[PDB]
Amino acid sequence: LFITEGYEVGRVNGLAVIGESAGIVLPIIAEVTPSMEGRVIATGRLQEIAREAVMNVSAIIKKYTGRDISNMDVHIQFVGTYEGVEGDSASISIATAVISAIEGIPVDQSVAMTGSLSVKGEVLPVGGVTQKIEAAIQAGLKKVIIPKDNIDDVLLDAEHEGKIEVIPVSRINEVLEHVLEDGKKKNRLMSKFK
Template sequence: KAYDVYYNKGSAIGRVNGLAVLAEGSAGLVLPIEAEIAPAASKEEGKLIATGKLGEIAKEAVQNVSALIKKLSGKDISKLDLHIQFLQTYHGVEGDSASISVATAVISALERIPVKQSLAMTGSLSVRGEVLPVGGVTEKVRAAIKAGFKEVIIPYANKQDVVLNKEELKKIKIIPVRTLHDVLKHAFEKHKRKKKLLATLEKIIAPNGLKLYLAKTLT
């Protein structure tokens, strides 16, 4: 028997409720993710340790977001040991849609800002911090409702893909997002560092800010 290992109340640092679907079926499920950060044990470089069947996806998500994190916090995560754990994985879970969850967990652990546990999320993340569409959105939102979550973050591009009845819609608030800035704005609890972090992130991934940032990094 599989036991549920997610929380749907309170807040936690480095812990995010992701959502996924089974590749061979259509059932949605909650995919809790935890990130822990420590100074690198090796003097040369830090290690990225990702456990669970989705380890490779976690590594890719972290690589995608590492440049953003460095710009955002001034912290080079290659000099830290980063441990990411998928707490409840099943055979056949597709996981590219876990990348905003991984990024949120990592930034929460780095900045020590708690994440709302009454909220779940799904979305893929580009290296620019844009939230990209994913599959199985209706199934994922249904899984969030069944698990008792109050809010769910989905990619803005998937807004029209959610097909729920009136009773289901009453049970959850759906939050469509375009960028990682939007994700953290809704997912993070109130915190003294949140405002500054969001202001910095907005400069990096706002259309003009992104062009300036890329121009600086490419020249």
């Protein structure tokens, strides 16, 4: 259902929790088209989660970089079906995808990410961080971005630490920097974070 290597525009490997206690990799795609009032189009089990996240991150989608979300239709899918899955609020993976789709700048697939984006651009802690890292290990992901406030919640058993890089972050700019493909477009998007 997800790619572990390479870069893809508008595609991010999020992490979620399947029922009571395993993590799963939650791949999302986002695309954006002119509104032609702009809607968020999402379907399935996690559709209200997606629409909510895009609504929360809308000022940072404009009030840093460029476009008003009310002038686009934003098309989101989770790749697969995830009954019994709880996704993060204001999930950073959905934000990154949408910013990735808009900028047309590809996202590294080998890096998984979990976190809640505040409306001020902070990355807030989330549950299930150990379960989620473990799922990223079992999937072959190289790195996992997590909330800095979750650093202490990671309780991996010797062997597993070492199997993946855990990158803790505070700010949405740190997430983009770590996952957006290098190049002039990124260098320019990156300078706009002030």
